[PDB]
Swiss-Prot record:
Its main location: secreted. Responsible for the biosynthesis of pyroglutamyl peptides. Has a bias against acidic and tryptophan residues adjacent to the N-terminal glutaminyl residue and a lack of importance of chain length after the second residue. Also catalyzes N-terminal pyroglutamate formation. May be involved in the N-terminal pyroglutamate formation of several amyloid-related plaque-forming peptides. The keyword 4Fe-4S does not apply. The active site is at E163 (proton acceptor), D210 (proton acceptor). This is Glutaminyl-peptide cyclotransferase. The lineage of its organism: Eukaryota, Metazoa, Chordata, Craniata, Vertebrata. It is found in: Secreted. Zn(2+) binds at D127, E164, H292. Belongs to the glutaminyl-peptide cyclotransferase family. GO terms for molecular function: glutaminyl-peptide cyclotransferase activity; zinc ion binding. InterPro entries: M28_QC, Peptidase_M28, QC/QCL. Glycans are attached at N17, N258. The keyword Acetylation does not apply. One of its GO terms (cellular component) is extracellular exosome.
Length: 323
């Protein structure tokens, strides 16, 4: 009876030295991400809408053009909603599908439904078009290194549909894509042919990005079983800062501060956390001032903060994967 599902508990990062950190900082481009990955997503894309289809095609196309051996799957399903039965489609992009373990980065790609108001349309720039674009930029910036994966551990990206409630949040109206996928993964043997382990046992850590893009975000260390990874993000931010590799950034105004948050935040990690998956929830507290407002747009995004977070996240992923 293999103890492989316990490997995640002892897994240590392979820390990048200064030269490698400079290489990662120089290898990501916030302007390229902005034009090629982010702007095409700054559209109305609530579940079932034409924009949802366009966003999904965009995400798939951007991953498909990369060299690394990404395996794309569209997880489509029906669910009851306040408006009756509707169809949703999660996007899953996986390197090494049969590898037993995967580090998983995720965000939601749907935008909250709002009827047009005074000619304005809700595009959820920080919620979560930026997180989507950060995951796509990470895949592009680290493409050569990820290609080398073609430690039975690899990388998976999940773009959840239906994170938002169609009305106001409630237990049955929200997290459509994540409740469905968590249940599906929990009931899917992994690796292929396994007798008693599931795809959830294979999830080393779920790093969920949400509401990123506003100025001065502060991310709390939410869970004790991922606290050591939160500390790594703090260390990475501190070293990139000391090396002069971050922009318009100070340690007093750092993003990963020594502070927990005992409350519960409802988001896509919930269906996974309640099934025992370790979660690193990269959501700020408090939420952006523009949260669920028509002002959650491109104009209110903080470019350098997103650039800094791209660097931190890419270093974190390479260190986790030993790349
Ligand atoms: Zn939202």
């Amino acid at each position: 009876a293999s103890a492989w599902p316990e490997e995640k508990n002892y897994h240590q990062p392979a820390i990048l030295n200064s030269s490698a950190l400079r290489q990662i900082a120089e290898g990501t481009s916030i302007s390229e991400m902005w034009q090629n990955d982010l702007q095409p997503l700054l559209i109305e894309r609530y579940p079932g809408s034409p924009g949802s289809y366009a966003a999904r095609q965009h995400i798939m196309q951007r991953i498909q053009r990369l060299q690394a051996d990404w395996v794309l799957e569209i997880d489509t399903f029906l669910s009851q909603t306040p408006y009756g039965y509707r169809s949703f489609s999660n996007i899953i992009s996986t390197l090494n599908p049969t590898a037993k373990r995967h580090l998983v980065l995720a965000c939601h790609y749907d935008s909250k439904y709002f009827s047009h108001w005074n000619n304005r349309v809700f595009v959820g720039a920080t919620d979560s078009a930026v997180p989507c674009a950060m995951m796509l930029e990470l895949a592009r910036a680290l493409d050569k290194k990820l290609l080398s994966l073609k430690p039975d551990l690899s990388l998976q990206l999940i773009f959840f549909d239906g994170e938002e409630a169609f009305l106001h949040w409630s237990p049955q109206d929200s997290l459509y894509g994540s409740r469905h996928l968590a249940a599906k993964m929990a009931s899917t043997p992994h690796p292929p042919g396994a007798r008693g382990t599931s795809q959830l046992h294979g999830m080393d850590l779920l790093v969920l990005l949400d509401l990123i893009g506003a100025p001065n975000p502060t991310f709390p260390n939410f869970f004790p079983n991922s606290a050591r990874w939160f500390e790594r993000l703090q260390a990475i931010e501190h070293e990139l800062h000391e090396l002069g590799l971050l922009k318009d950034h100070s340690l007093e105004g750092r993003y990963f501060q020594n502070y927990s948050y005992g409350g519960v935040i409802q988001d896509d990690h919930i269906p996974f956390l309640r099934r025992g998956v370790p979660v690193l929830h990269l959501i700020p507290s408090p939420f952006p001032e523009v949260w669920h407002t028509m002002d959650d747009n491109e104009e209110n995004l903080d470019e350098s903060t997103i650039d800094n977070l791209n660097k931190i996240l890419q270093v974190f992923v390479l260190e986790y994967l030993h790349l």
